[PDB]
């Protein structure tokens, strides 16, 4: 639903990189370039953001 706080493999913090990752993609960055810009070098961390699905955005559409 929401970006995991840590990378599952190594425990690097990735929950502060989703909005930055989205912004970089908005800036015409390629996914590989955006991940590099965020410092995610290990492919375990790149996996976290490259494969994340932000369903919480859909859930916020439903009224509480």
Partner 1 sequence: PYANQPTVRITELTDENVKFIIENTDLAVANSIRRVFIAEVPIIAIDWVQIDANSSVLHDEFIAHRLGLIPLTSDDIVDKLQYSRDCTCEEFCPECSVEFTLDVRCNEDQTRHVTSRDLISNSPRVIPVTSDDILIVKLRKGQELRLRAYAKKGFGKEHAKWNPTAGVAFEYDPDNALRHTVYPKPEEWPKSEYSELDEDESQAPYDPNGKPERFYYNVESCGSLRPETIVLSALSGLKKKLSDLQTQLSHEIQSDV
Partner 2 sequence: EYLRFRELPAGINSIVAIASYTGYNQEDSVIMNRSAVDRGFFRSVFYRSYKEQESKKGFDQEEVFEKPTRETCQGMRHAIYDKLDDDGLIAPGVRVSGDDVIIGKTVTLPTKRDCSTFLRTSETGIVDQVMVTLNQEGYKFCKIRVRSVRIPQIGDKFASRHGQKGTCGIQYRQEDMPFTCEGITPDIIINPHAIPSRMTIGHLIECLQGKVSANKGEIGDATPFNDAVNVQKISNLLSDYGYHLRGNEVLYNGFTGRKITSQIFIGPTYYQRLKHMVDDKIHSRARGPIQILNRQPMEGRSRDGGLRFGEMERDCQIAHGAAQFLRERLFEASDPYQV
Residue positions forming the annotated binding site for Zn(2+): 7, 10, 44-45
Burial 3-30 (b: 16+ CB within 10 A, else e): beeebeeeebebeebbeebeebeeeebe
Tell me the two tokens of residue 29.
Answer: 């960055």
Residue showing tokens 């996996």: 47
| Residues in contact with Zn ion, shown as a per-residue x/- string from 13 to 52 under the rule CB under 5 A | -----------------------------x-xx-------
Q: Which does 18 bind (CB under 5 to 8 A by kind): partner 2, Zn ion, partner 1, none?
A: partner 1
The residue ranges that bind partner 2 (CB under 8 A) are 4-11, 30-36, 42-44, 46-47, 50-51, 53, 55, 58
């Amino acid at each position: 639903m929401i970006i995991p706080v840590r990378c599952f493999t190594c425990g690097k913090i990735v929950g502060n990189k989703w909005e930055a990752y989205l912004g970089l993609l908005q800036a015409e960055y390629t996914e590989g370039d955006a991940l590099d810009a965020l410092g995610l070098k290990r492919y375990c961390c790149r996996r976290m953001l490259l494969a994340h699905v932000d369903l919480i955005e859909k859930l916020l559409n439903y009224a509480p």
